[model samples]
Target: SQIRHYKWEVEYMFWAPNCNENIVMGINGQFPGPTIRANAGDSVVVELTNKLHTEGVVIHWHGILQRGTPWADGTASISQCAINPGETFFYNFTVDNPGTFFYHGHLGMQRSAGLYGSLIVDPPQGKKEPFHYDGEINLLLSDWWHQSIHKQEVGLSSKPIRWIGEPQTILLNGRGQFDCSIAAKYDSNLEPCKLKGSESCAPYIFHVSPKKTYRIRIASTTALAALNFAIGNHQLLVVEADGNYVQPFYTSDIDIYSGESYSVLITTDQNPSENYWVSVGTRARHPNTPPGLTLLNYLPNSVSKLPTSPPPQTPAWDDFDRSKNFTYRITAAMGSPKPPVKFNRRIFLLNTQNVINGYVKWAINDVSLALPPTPYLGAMKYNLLHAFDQNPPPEVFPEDYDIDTPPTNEKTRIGNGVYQFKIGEVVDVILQNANMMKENLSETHPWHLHGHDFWVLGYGDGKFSAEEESSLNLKNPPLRNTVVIFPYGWTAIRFVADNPGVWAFHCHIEPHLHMGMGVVFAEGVEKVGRIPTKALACGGTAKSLINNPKNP
Candidate 1:
């Protein structure tokens, strides 16, 4: 578990679901370039060389316990640095947990354009805690943009605007049957694309036996909606969340967020009455589900008819509620929809910038981050967490909850950044939603942080009474990594900044992110964390040249 030689250098391609005879953003002309096989406790590195002048590249290790390791968590805005064009930066972090997870690019729109691969971590082989792996299957989930993603990035890059839906094709492990390799496409042939994947993802197949329990590690890296997942003919016993273990609950249907992952010990020991659908796709959080963006399909088991019918949805196993009551807001400063960023969000930072069409600015409760120059999170006794109990500005809002409505729902705004704190310090972010103004602002946004999980503090709808405010004790709150900022309500969440790194603290709602509804957490060593970076190589050309002068 201690060896971390994690580095890779790959090129980009403008890939699709089933175009160009089934292809991908060619990593030097290869699909799913290389399967990363590493063990827990092993440190990892990655170098994503942007080959597309037309597009950018990034890699997000889905379902790995960055153990709350912010810097290496790979979310672009999280002070954790990004893999910029023609540049290389190392993603050095140890894989502490041994389980199946996946990884993909988090750059400007690369992942959707077919810029991703799978990550498999073995628990040092034979080191068994419980489940046997005679029939294990790893499923990496994503979507395909029939159109050009780079072009979309350019159009959307103008500013953070709410893009409700853009449904297309659903993909699994880069193929139709979750197949590992690319399949041949026939020109006048019956299938333009394979049943499972398009050009973006090919040959999808998660072939396993029906006798043993298989480990189905599911990761939904869709940039848009949260997924509703199902498996073939059987139910998945929920075991893990993100990359860590949650209380192992059993369920037939599961709801997974975009940045979230789950590991289910599924028993294929079914009687094979009928073929089950191991298909998953977007759930319409919005009222009307669009056409193109609804990506998912069903495959018939050997025991069923020629083609299987998609199963009726069982009650989704969303055992945990994001919040009983909470408030969410997404607005930016200096945009066409809302001009002159709110003065409240602006004050969160010591410095600020103003743009004409207005540079996209997004934050949580108004805070960007202190790039390395200024002090980042307060230093802690342990290098791992935020400095706690220090004489710093308290993060919780005072007793008065002056809840108001925002004109729009865009978090990328110039001005105040999200709230900040020292190591080991825990505080509640009372998200006061003042968005009674914007059109279609009733839906809630999932607030996500790059590095750590927090406790869901007391959250409720409407304004908090004086009595409710007085009853608050900042000491104990439920801990979680992502909290849904409910619509028309207020939610307070608490978490310690244990992992030091630049992390993004923002709403997980895809529309909000593309439209700038998040802020960066300049974690690690202060005064130098705010700048964006290139995803570097652990041992590639970039690393060779940088470290070995002879190569340069």
Candidate 2:
């Protein structure tokens, strides 16, 4: 295996992604950053220089299991402190598995500001994939808003809680279209929108030879939207998800939540004379933005030729059945390892939306997550338990609690609590979804776990029960790093706490996470060895370093 190195400078630039000009965070002067391609077992090293004039930055390697190098996970305030502006931070980790992954800004709402890119890991030398495809295509998906991230952040934390409404547009590979008329109405003095021949707002075009099968790697980093992806008149054969091989299945469209990735195979057997429309529409919420569009150009056809037909259609926004049915069809590939039938510990995390200190926040049980100033990994490793909240979070919520209406307890509070786990112990997490402060207004939450992938056992609507355990697919549950808990539904997942590190388990939606919708999981952190001095150069650890005699 070889070592792959990359030097990235993160800064802001003015560009029109959806025909609307705005400042977005870009890496190496490119929005959506740059792709990193490596083989399994390769060591990937990135030297990231935070060039932003004010805000700190950290880039999380979304699907890479950091294994022995947990500090490289790149979570702000959890795995490590954010890299200060103008400072350089080195991320070194091994890519243990072959998969379609990605990297994105993990601090605050920077990811929503267009700071992300693809990370593709191929099989090791002499190793081959189980499925065959003549070529591959990468489609990184995200939702875009016109308002600045700072404004959005202020609105969410304000007393009157201004929610970040539906996105103005959807983006595919960092490009999308916006209504120029609407742009003109919003800013009469602004230059006219360039709908065509503009590199920033141009649609992505995929060129393929007829009758050849191609593998499409799809990943979403959306801040608030669950997406439905489709290629008009084409069938997608599902093959891999979250780096794990799954039993192949056929579907016209696929649902992708934030922090999730999928690889599908499509044969270009359609008419060679005409191009097809590739589209992505928002799902699970009332969509106000137009679908993101691209083109599937057959061989010998001009890439600039747009399809005459309308964009492909997706399922109705509120069609929960369609989403659930597609999710349930995925299973571990034949010969894949089965999940442990019995778990050493089971934790029920009831997700709720409540008011904490007059700020509208999402919570787990009754605690809204408030990250401590010190890094949890440093605190746990250095025996500085007093650095964070002393009380541990609740493992289970009251069974008699109602899930249909707004919470009546009114006891929600902020916390930096963590759920500790013993090394090698199998743990089951049941993510229970509940109504927000508003009655009949529960929403879907895509939960993501760092440092490891877990087996998704099952999902059920409404409240969860112990008896429902019998229906879970322990025999062939597909392994994934992120899974969705539907509105008023519960999703069960199991994983062994073998990775020694403090990890973040939380909703992948940027605003939800910012508004206190997450928890910490410290698994065998006592065994995580000494953290790099660079990562410890913040908070309590930095103070400790200043008083040390060796450093003077």
Candidate 3:
């Protein structure tokens, strides 16, 4: 194993993503940033220099289990503070897992402001994949908004609680196009509709040789959209999800929520003379934007030429049963370790949308998540109990509670809450989804946990119960870090709290996280060993800073 060093200069740049030019926060002036590729067991070292004139910055290496190095987990307020403007922070962690992962700005609203990149880790030498492919393709999916992130933040924090309506377009990779005719209808209109760069707007193209099998990596950092991605004339063999190998299944379309990743094998054996359209459409909600399209050009054809075929169509937005069928098809690969079949502790997190302090927010139980001034990990390391909530958060909600109806009262409270666990204890958690503070509307939430992957036991519609124990998958359950909880449904996951850190467990939707839809976990913090002084410098200093300001 060798050291792979990268220098990332975080700065501001002006560019048109969806034909609308705006200032975007980027890494090395590249929108969507740059991809990092490394072999497993290699040391991945990144020297990040923050050049932005406003706000702080930190890149969370999502899904990386920072094993013995919890200090490197780049979560603002959870692990460490943001890299202040003009300050340089060095993130040194090992690429211990062979998987498809991603890095994004973890600070508020920055990921939606065009600050993210792909991080692909290959298996070590002599380690072969369980499946075979001739070549590989990577497509990072995301939602696009025409409005600036600053304005979006302001609107979300405004009185009367304005929600960030819907995204204008869905972007494949870094490119998408907005409907300017729709923009022209508003009072602040663009007269004579300009289409200078519209014709040449490039979509992400995947080139494949005929009859060859290729592995396609599909990952999303979409702010709010639950996407259904499909390709015309192609059916994919499901191979992996969230960095773990799964029993191969077949599907033409997939329901991918935010912060989820999947790897599928596709053969280019279709009509060899013609190219086909690759489509990504929104799901789980009313979609106002049209499907984003790319071309799967079969080679010896010119990839630059546009295809004349119709874009692929996905299922209806509310087809929950179809989505459940697709998601439930996943099973662990053979020889995978089975979960303990029993856990030492069980917790139930009830998700609901309610109004708190006149602000619309999503909550786990009654607490709408808030952050403290100091980083939770650092504060814990220095024994600063005053920096966070001292009272233990509740483990379960009332048994008589009804989850089907919308919450009538805005009884949600706001606090910086956390759940503590003993080291090496097996824990089971059931995340239940509820109505979104309205009579008939509910939303799907993708829950992502940092620092460790968990086994998905099962998913059931409506409230979960102890009788559902018979349905849990104790034998060869798929292991993943992110799981999507369907509307009015519940997902159960079990994990061993072996890693020592203050990790974030939250909704992966960008805007939803910004609106208090998450919680923290402090597991075995006492067993974290020596604390790194540099990691404690961002937020108000712990004891490490109280002694030496220059170094800390």
Candidate 4:
């Protein structure tokens, strides 16, 4: 708990619970401004005092692959730039594979106007409590919109605006919902709002202590909503995802899609006299995202007045992730049954217009990371290869469009030839999220892929689940880089690209990566081919400090 330097100070105004301001974006002022925890090798300097007045910040820690710095992967404009205002930037990076991860404001709508927080990384201690629980929590759930995370991803392209009740104000570890607003009013920040400058609905509230054994750290920086979360009745036991860990699995409803991350573990003894509800909603299938629900209060601190309604415990997301094995078929529009093989490359998932004013306007194969950071080829050059189709996972449906049609979740589909594998090839990717006939917005895309580790071969959201049967662990399965792809459903993945360098897959949900999602795989092919632009990544004890092992 000591490797710090935080400094933040980015403003806007409008604080809450009586927070009379109303323009907020702060950091030093604090919302999600403090909380770094570090202790793996410890060397964390954050020192980012940007005072944001407009464009210029990049801190992104999210998951940590550390492959060569990537300049602290804050990705303001794809890695660097945008720390303007007073400017100071420092990101460093190193919690080398820690549990629970977070740290936002990589710019654009500044973590939906609140930036973000929470980061834990401890794994040097005696190591072995991966999950046996003695109680560990870091639930930094967020969403504070008053609007302007870039006009809310251009109004999420159309609908599902959290369901657009407008002017929402919900949060949990950050506090919201009837603790009884001591101040913050715009109608009093609309019940901690789920979203509404364009519209949103994800109200949040969760309290638990009936049988105690809870350990949950869930994250979803909403800009467009793809969350299908459910802990309401409670039963979730998923050990980890996004930060790795996956031998322990249980599920009672957890469909996190916007930059998804989950670490569930609930063992309740249920007897706090009565009170429970963790529910979260929104599965509209993205016709422009719409649907939200929130209700909280678990009572037992000795009880305080939360019984107007209390008695819900239906959690079963799958009672231990049950192990579905394989299936994913998210959509925006495209088809590739089984072509390509030289190297397997296709990146085009667009959403252009101002993009912070850098210019995306839709592209992948058409290329438009704009080609600046230039490294060339590493991270193995995108080669998962294919095999896991044990079956079960294919039902795709949803078509109607016209809320004004044009959701290029961004673009990318260029696969012709580039194959050259040999380092232990185990690729089995089957991503085809675009069957566009209509019904648009189609949501569900926790689709993250930065720096390898993939496994989760079936997502059935489009219905296709005959009776479940994907249990293939290949041998281990639970590597995680960020994965969700469930809206119309059809997610299939397996991975062996074996991390080398130059990797940036895309869609960890920043409004679908600000409308243009992502892609830059480029996996394994270097005899001496390509990989250099500034490339350097690998700092986290702030920059230096190895450890045989001793962190906790």
- Name the top lDDT candidate: 2
Model number with the top TM-score? 2
Evaluate model 4: give its TM-score.
0.28
lDDT values, one for every candidate? 0.47, 0.89, 0.84, 0.48
* Runs with alpha carbons beyond 4 Å of true place in candidate 3: 180-200, 304-308, 538-544, 548-552
lDDT for 315 (candidate 3) = 87
Which tens-of-lDDT digit does each residue in 274-377 have in candidate 1? 44445564553531221111112222354213224433443322312422311111111121111111112111211111122443433334332222211122
Question: For candidate 2, what is the lDDT?
Answer: 0.89
Q: After superposition, how far is residue 165 of candidate 2 from its true place, in Å?
A: 1.1
Q: What's every prediction's RMSD, in angstroms?
A: 10.6, 3.4, 3.8, 23.1
Question: Please, what are the lDDT tens digits per residue for candidate 4 over residues 1-552?
Answer: 356566666666556521334555657776666778766766677767666565666667777765545546665433443456775766665566567777777555567677777777767656664457656656665545444555665565444333222335445555443323211232344443333222112233455545568677787766555444564455676766666665454556666655666677876665456544454544333222212333334545432333333333323333212223311211111221221122232121322122222332323322323222212332222222221111222122123312134434433322212223344466655443433324453434556665555655444444233353343233333456666543344455565665443445666555545444554443444432322222212212212223346585
Kindly give the number of clashing pairs for every candidate.
102, 0, 0, 126
Error of 1 at 387 (Å): 24
Q: Estimate each model's TM-score.
A: 0.67, 0.96, 0.94, 0.28
How many residue pairs in model 3 have overlapping backbones? 0
In candidate 3, position 26 carries an lDDT of: 78
